[PDB]
Write a protein that binds this ligand. Sequence first.
Ligand SMILES: *[C@H](O)[C@H](C[C@@H]1CCNC1=O)NC(=O)[C@H](CC(C)C)NC(=O)OCc1ccccc1
Ligand SMILES: *[C@H](O)[C@H](C[C@@H]1CCNC1=O)NC(=O)[C@H](CC(C)C)NC(=O)OCc1ccccc1
Lengths: 304, 305
Amino acid sequence: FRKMAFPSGKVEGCMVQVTCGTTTLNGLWLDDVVYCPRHVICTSEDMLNPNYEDLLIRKSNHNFLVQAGNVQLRVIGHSMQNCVLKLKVDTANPKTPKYKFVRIQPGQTFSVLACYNGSPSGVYQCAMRPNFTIKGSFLNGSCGSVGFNIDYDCVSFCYMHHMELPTGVHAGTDLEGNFYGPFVDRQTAQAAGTDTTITVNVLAWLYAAVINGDRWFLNRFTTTLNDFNLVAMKYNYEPLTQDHVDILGPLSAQTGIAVLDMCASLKELLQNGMNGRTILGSALLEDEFTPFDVVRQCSGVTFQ
Amino acid sequence: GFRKMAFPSGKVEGCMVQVTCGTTTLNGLWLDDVVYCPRHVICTSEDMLNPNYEDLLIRKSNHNFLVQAGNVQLRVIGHSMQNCVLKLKVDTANPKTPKYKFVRIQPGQTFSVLACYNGSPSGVYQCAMRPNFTIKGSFLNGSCGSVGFNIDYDCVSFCYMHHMELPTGVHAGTDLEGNFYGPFVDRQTAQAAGTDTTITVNVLAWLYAAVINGDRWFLNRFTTTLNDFNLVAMKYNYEPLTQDHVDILGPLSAQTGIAVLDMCASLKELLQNGMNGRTILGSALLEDEFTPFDVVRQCSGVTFQ
Ligand SMILES: *[C@H](O)[C@H](C[C@@H]1CCNC1=O)NC(=O)[C@H](CC(C)C)NC(=O)OCc1ccccc1
Ligand SMILES: *[C@H](O)[C@H](C[C@@H]1CCNC1=O)NC(=O)[C@H](CC(C)C)NC(=O)OCc1ccccc1
């Protein structure tokens, strides 16, 4: 079972660079709008506590350099929405895919197209942690790189990159510019909350193990959802929501193992450990595969 | 903790097509006016058990090949076989053909795979060519003709085309000249690989990545000679470390201030003592599928912990 990213071509065709002065970051070009982090308008001095409303009133369309490679796109309008800048340009991107902007929950996975100077560098899969941070590679110049999922022909953009926290983890916004988590776009030390294990994804991975015939951990017990949630919290596992129970439905149906029976199996693994045994060849419980990821990787779903 | 990163797949996505012969469907790679695909597309279920490919191919005409680029049929106007790959000349040039090369990769090197089904891209992930010439991929029925590649500037270097799954669940395939990596054959028979070994230079690169990310518990004050390291490495079915490998670890050694032979002494202790339930970069196992180049790409401008 490997992390698999979505094919990145539909997103590569949307990446541009945005420059104010000597500050360059990435933007997302959809139709005739370029979306990017608003801190492109900040200088070194502005960054500790920028007054973004005051910095933006001093900017005109002609102050923004938007480039698709070396090709300039003329800016014909600008506005700020939360922590994102929207630059209207005079050219509709002919590579614009069918798309949506979505706000994801903790535990949801997405692909990141890491970009520098508007040029795609790499693609990887990551998970939104319960503390609203992501673990992955973002270097200087990576801001405005996006996270996404693809369903059939349609790109759901869920993340735009803004900052690195002291622990080396990353924080950003949805494409409406609202941060995930209690973070703000200013050059100040900010701490993430204590992270927890993504319970719904551990359950998905136990279902994946059962599908592949690795089922030694199936016990003969059940639990209520409330009793499970109170025990899970003692082991720094996220409580399950009704939505989590429902998204496990397909794997529960495929395996014939009721969700609350799998919860009872996980509770015994937390209380007793694995006693030297492995699951899918791992001594560690994996929490960055969603129920969708398990079905996707076992069933060979494509996109176009 | 430290993630595998694939190359952006768009330049390859624009080359993927579907190839069908009778009821056998797989993927092809469309470059200029040629579609490259695994030759076993010409086999029925029965043929795949023990195929005489020259005999099976002479019984085929251009019209027996259905090539589809999405909805659009590409007319086949010529065919030839090069080792285990079929080359279908079509009457249309692919406008999305990138600058490209065909390369044969060395064991220990990494590449990105674009897994495809019915000519449609499904997923992208990083693989290493193992010393036993298998890859640990994710490939289902219909995945054959999926390719592996690296990208340098604008240029796609295609190194792998997918053909089969071994009984152990690992994967085997060819270069784009149709020559298998490893002692495998394109027949529906159970095939074992040679006993695999661990890619030593890649483990060392990953331990450097761990140190750069502040994960340092495994460092020690032993050093070793290269020869004495290699004696222990070989005992544990690790590949020998060459002076060329020591040289390519130079930049990571400079970044961390840990001499390559000091990192070798750390790895020797990990092999002899195990990890004792501890993790490195959140892994319970020593990872050998990042090259020094792969690590340098992610660690370049990182501030030392
Ligand atoms: C945007 O490209 C950049 C991304 C950071 C830089 C290093 N890795 C990243 O993920 N964001 C910032 O520089 C950001 C700007 C503020 C106005 C939000 N500040 C930030 O992340 O500060 C922490 C930091 C900066 C530079 C190097 C290491 C950490
Ligand atoms: C091409 O789409 C397909 C890919 C396989 C299917 C499952 N996962 C994969 O990677 N290749 C084959 O089906 C291949 C065709 C031969 C004519 C090369 N057969 C195959 O891999 O068989 C392996 C095997 C045969 C007999 C016993 C045990 C394993």
